[PDB]
Amino acid sequence: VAQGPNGRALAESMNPDLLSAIQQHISIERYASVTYLAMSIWCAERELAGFYQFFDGAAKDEQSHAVHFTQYLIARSQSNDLQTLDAPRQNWDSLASLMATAFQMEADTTSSIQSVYALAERNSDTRTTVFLDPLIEAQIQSEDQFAYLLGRVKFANGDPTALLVIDNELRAGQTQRG
Amino acid sequence: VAQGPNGRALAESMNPDLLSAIQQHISIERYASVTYLAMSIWCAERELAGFYQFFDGAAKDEQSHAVHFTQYLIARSQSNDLQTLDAPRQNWDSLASLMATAFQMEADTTSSIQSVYALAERNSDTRTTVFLDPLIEAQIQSEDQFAYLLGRVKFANGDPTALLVIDNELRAGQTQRG
Amino acid sequence: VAQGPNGRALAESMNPDLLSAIQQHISIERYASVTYLAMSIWCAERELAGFYQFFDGAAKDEQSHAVHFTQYLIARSQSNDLQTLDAPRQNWDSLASLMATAFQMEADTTSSIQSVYALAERNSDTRTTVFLDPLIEAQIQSEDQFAYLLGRVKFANGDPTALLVIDNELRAGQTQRG
Amino acid sequence: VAQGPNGRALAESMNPDLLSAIQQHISIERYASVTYLAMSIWCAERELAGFYQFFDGAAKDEQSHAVHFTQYLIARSQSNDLQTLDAPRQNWDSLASLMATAFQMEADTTSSIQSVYALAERNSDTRTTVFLDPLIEAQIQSEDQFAYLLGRVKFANGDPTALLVIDNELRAGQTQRG
Ligand SMILES: [Cl-]
Ligand SMILES: [Cl-]
Ligand SMILES: [Cl-]
Ligand SMILES: [Cl-]
């Protein structure tokens, strides 16, 4: 029985390029987390308490997703490499513009998973593609969700009354099409 | 004891014109079903989740109504004839215009039942007029309901805030005057 | 942030050939639905109440599967295109022959999903292959199930007593090997 | 305030031909009752306990239907006229032949109601047509039911095993398509 790079018993070696891609994706999701935290604060600063609560929970969820990836590296007996975290964006001209960044950030998160996925397929790492499958499924749901929130906010067309109504929807947990 | 056209024991023969009218009405209700499905999708595409949920349920209900008619033909020992289903309308310029088509589609469904009803009266088919009576009663309730939804959406006069409020009413199941 | 063909925010563009394949598959499943409805009626016409109940539920389930696909197109910000629905087959010489068509229809449904699946792999659309994975798993279960029902009916070898026994099994919900 | 023929206050006079038709129909349903009793006995004599139980209950139900008609005459302040009851048929060569008579007897019961119904329409007696409407609805259900039982027994094609299976279905209360 051989030892993996993190010292645990090694079930199967992992391509170093694939390892680097996973460690980088963990950074993407940690960055999405602090980005949602920044968005939470921006919303709280404008008394959009429902949006604040939503993004506060989104920040904690994204962090969980990131930690889920660190557990997989442990499971594969690979080293983690927790990297420097950039500062998030913190300024937006409007809720609509913030929601656009939020959607793009979710779509970008999926793109990063897809990049890892293609690398695992190139290396025939079926453990990794199986590991990623439900995470892609969750990304589809999050993309559907953020397109719903973005589109609903754009439908409001900057009217505060409509934004207050949507804000209260979010505070109540009404956050997707259902 | 004689056998009906579908092979079951025959309680009383049915005029072939009346049979054709019922088979055609089953198509009307199947078409209303796929029409409400199309309307559900149009609403979902614009993040009108309450309207989406309402029309998704309306599609399943209309299909039930159609199957209820197939059961009556079985009960009368008559053959069913499930026909080609046209594609539904799928494009509207506005929610108000969609709701207008929905109301017209409900009124048209009633007209088709009324046409069957008059044919049964001409043929003195009291089983059929009795069978249709509660379905006409349901149509009155659906017409009242769709006139309420249409009129409420027209009252909104295209304002997104008002449409979001109505959307949330539908998501909560507040779908008629009560 | 770009807009998809159905107007929603677009997480990633979809190949038009893949879109057409999904819209066509939705038709396959809608057609399987009305086919099971026709089979329900054929069974009811011959007092095979258990088979009637089974196929009535199978029709509603297939329709749900179809709507599940329309939701995915919405989630991907792609247009739906609900198409003309052919009339189903409605005549069989025997229950055994009906069950043969039912099994073939289920196997054909899987073939259509597999065709979509290969197209998504060619286009590296991992959202779609992930989306299809549990639907293929369900198809395996349905194929196993319909092979069980078909084989059990063939074992009866046209004996009415055996068919009545199986009919009662279906009415009780005993519809697979367990 | 005028008095009706049975001495009660009279809401509206009833055509004597319509009165006679109702009194005659009450005889039809009393005769259907004793006929189902005879069928119950025939089945019990051949150890077909499920069919015996079914027809014993059918006899009591038909009697209830008859009494429901006497209550309507009372409600209309019309005299009842309980008539001589013929002896029922009591001999059949087979269960299939008995079930054929049972179905015909149910269809004949509906024909008699339809005859009353047409007479009330000729006389514009809307109380009577309204009174008869749910009874016609019940007749549709009974015709559907007896066509199911007859067809299932004919499917058995005289095989005792199949008849024992159906017999047990009836004893369990499985008496229609459901
Ligand atoms: Cl805004
Ligand atoms: Cl509008
Ligand atoms: Cl067979
Ligand atoms: Cl027999």
Smallest Cα distance from A6 to chain C, Å: 30
C-alpha distance across the termini of chain C, in Å? 49
Please indicate whether, in this complex, the C-beta atoms of D110 and B12 are within 8 angstroms of each other. Answer: yes
**Alpha helix positions (H), A76-94:** none
Ligand 4 mean position, distance from CA D38 (Å) = 17
**Under DSSP, is residue B94 helix (H, G, I), strand (E, B) or coil?**
coil
Buried b (16+ CB within 10 A) or exposed e, C2-27: eebbbebbbbbebeeebbebbbebbb
Closest CA to A141 of B46, C7, C20, C74: C74
The answer to whether A174 and A50 are in contact (CB under 8 A) is: no
CA distance C40 to C57: 9
Question: Resolution of the coordinates in A?
Answer: 1.9
C13 touches chain A (CB under 8 A): no
B74 touches chain D (CB under 8 A): yes
Chain B residues in contact with D110 by the CB 8 A cut-off are 11-12, 127
D176 touches chain B (CB under 8 A): no
Q: Is B165 left (phi over 0), alpha (psi -120 to 50) or beta?
A: alpha
Question: What is the separation of C-alpha C122 from the centre of its chain, rounded to a whole number of angstroms?
Answer: 24
Enclosing domain of residue C164: 1-178
Is A29 annotated as a binding-site member? Answer: yes
B44 touches chain A (CB under 8 A): yes
**Tokens 């269809």 appear where?**
D107
Ligand 3 mean position, distance from CA C97 (Å) = 7
Is B12 annotated as a binding-site member? Answer: no
Question: What is the separation of C-alpha B52 from the centre of its chain, rounded to a whole number of angstroms?
Answer: 17
C-alpha distance from residue C155 to each of C96, C143, C147, C151, C159 (Å): 10, 18, 12, 6, 9
C-alpha distance from residue B8 to each of B29, D103, D105 (Å): 25, 11, 16
Total domain count for chain C?
A: 1
Structure tokens at D23: 């009194």
Q: Smallest Cβ distance to B86: which of C44, C67, C84?
A: C84
CA distance C120 to A128: 19
Chain D residues 85-124 with CB within 8 Å of chain B: 100, 103-104, 106-107, 110-111, 114, 117-118
Ligand nearest to the CA of A155: 1
Smallest Cα distance from D60 to chain C, Å: 26
**Under DSSP, is residue D3 helix (H, G, I), strand (E, B) or coil?**
strand
Q: Is D9 left (phi over 0), alpha (psi -120 to 50) or beta?
A: beta
Q: Tell me which chain C residue has its CA closest to the CA of residue D146.
A: C47
Please indicate whether, in this complex, the C-beta atoms of B34 and C82 are within 8 angstroms of each other. Answer: yes
Q: Which residues pair with B9 in a beta bridge?
A: B3
C161 touches chain A (CB under 8 A): no
CA distance B37 to C152: 37
Closest CA to D164 of D38, D36, D49, D44: D49
C126 touches chain A (CB under 8 A): yes
Ligand nearest to the CA of B92: 2
Ligand 1 mean position, distance from CA A155 (Å) = 9
Q: Smallest Cβ distance to D147: which of B9, B124, B126?
A: B9
The answer to whether A99 and A40 are in contact (CB under 8 A) is: no
Q: Which residues pair with A3 in a beta bridge?
A: A9
C71 touches chain B (CB under 8 A): yes
Is C133 annotated as a binding-site member? Answer: yes
Please indicate whether, in this complex, the C-beta atoms of D103 and B130 are within 8 angstroms of each other. Answer: no
**Under DSSP, is residue C85 helix (H, G, I), strand (E, B) or coil?**
strand
Smallest Cα distance from A45 to chain C, Å: 25
State the burial class of residue A138 (Cβ atoms within 10 Å of its Cβ: 0-12, 13-18, 19+): middle
Question: Are A and D neighbours with ≥3 CB pairs closer than 8 A?
Answer: no
Q: What is the DSSP letter of A157?
A: T
Please indicate whether, in this complex, the C-beta atoms of B171 and A178 are within 8 angstroms of each other. Answer: yes
Q: What is the DSSP letter of B123?
A: T
Ligand 3 mean position, distance from CA C176 (Å) = 18
State the burial class of residue A73 (Cβ atoms within 10 Å of its Cβ: 0-12, 13-18, 19+): buried
Closest CA to D114 of A111, B124, B171: B124
